Design a protein around this ligand. Structure first.
Ligand SMILES: Nc1ncnc2c1ncn2[C@@H]1O[C@H](COP(=O)(O)O)[C@@H](O)[C@H]1O
Length: 263
């Protein structure tokens, strides 16, 4: 485990979280408890989910100085987050859980999260439409939250030093900006189209038709009919998947959902 040791990066994360004594913070991963201490100083209460009980002496040290820290010994991917009353999340994430934890957290909901990821993952999360790093992850996150990289974090900020840079990412859920009609269909639609990111949406959907439970012939005919509904749809489905904006992918998928349900 590469512990975050550089207090300057702890400070940047904590600052980005805009904490007050009315906030309740979830942290994932205890590490040395440096970040934990700063959270406890500034927030009402902090929950820490930590899988490795050999880190208990760090927990015990903290609990001597702070009365507002609760340690949950367990797997963050398994814990029922619905049962905890946090409004913010601040963590140097265990990188291996980056994707599922992000969506688990977003599903549960929060006012704001400030999370450290490996740099390449963060770049993908925030990537602009039509760029090399833009993909399913980018749209999956940006359709649900405003995201931005707060700071790049060098290997030297950790001990032992990792092989790659990390990045602090601020995530602010934003449900009403894009308004997903049906989350499960949206998820299936994203999966299908990003299996062929350099093809037109139309051709991607045909190739991946089985991801939406249609055979290739069915899907071809569906899209013929769909394209005839209006000129905007025609223009969207003929563009390359990775070139459509998040707004356009959300609206296209919403329209397609409504189309299929009507049919
Ligand atoms: N799924 C998990 N839930 C809670 N804590 C974890 C989980 N996975 C790893 N950790 C802890 O987070 C620390 C950072 O993860 P890692 O740097 O990927 O080894 C590790 O030392 C573990 O103690």
């Amino acid at each position: 485990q590469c512990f975050l040791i550089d207090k300057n990066f702890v400070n940047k994360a904590v600052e980005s979280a805009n904490l007050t004594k009315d906030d309740v913070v979830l942290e994932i991963g205890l590490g040395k408890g440096i970040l934990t201490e700063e959270l406890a100083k500034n927030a009402k209460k902090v929950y820490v989910i930590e899988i490795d009980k050999s880190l208990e002496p760090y927990a015990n040290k903290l609990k001597e100085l702070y009365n507002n820290i609760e340690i949950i010994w367990g797997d963050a991917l398994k814990v029922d987050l619905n049962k905890l009353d946090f409004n913010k999340v601040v963590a140097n994430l265990p990188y291996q859980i980056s994707s599922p934890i992000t969506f688990k957290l977003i599903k549960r909901g929060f006012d704001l999260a400030v999370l450290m990821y490996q740099y390449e993952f963060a770049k993908r999360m925030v990537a602009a439409a039509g760029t090399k790093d833009y993909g399913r992850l980018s749209v999956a996150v940006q359709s649900r939250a405003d995201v931005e990289i707060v700071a790049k974090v060098p290997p030297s900020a950790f001990y032992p030093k990792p092989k790659v840079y990390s990045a602090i990412v601020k995530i602010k859920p934003n449900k009403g900006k894009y308004h997903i009609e049906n989350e499960n269909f949206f998820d299936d639609f994203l999966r299908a189209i990003f299996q062929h990111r350099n093809k037109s949406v139309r051709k991607a959907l045909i190739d991946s038709s089985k991801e939406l439970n249609y055979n290739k012939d069915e899907m071809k005919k569906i899209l013929e009919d769909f394209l005839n509904t209006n000129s905007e749809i025609k223009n969207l489905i003929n563009e390359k998947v990775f070139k459509l904006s998040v707004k356009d992918i959300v609206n296209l998928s919403n329209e397609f959902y409504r189309f299929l349900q009507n049919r």
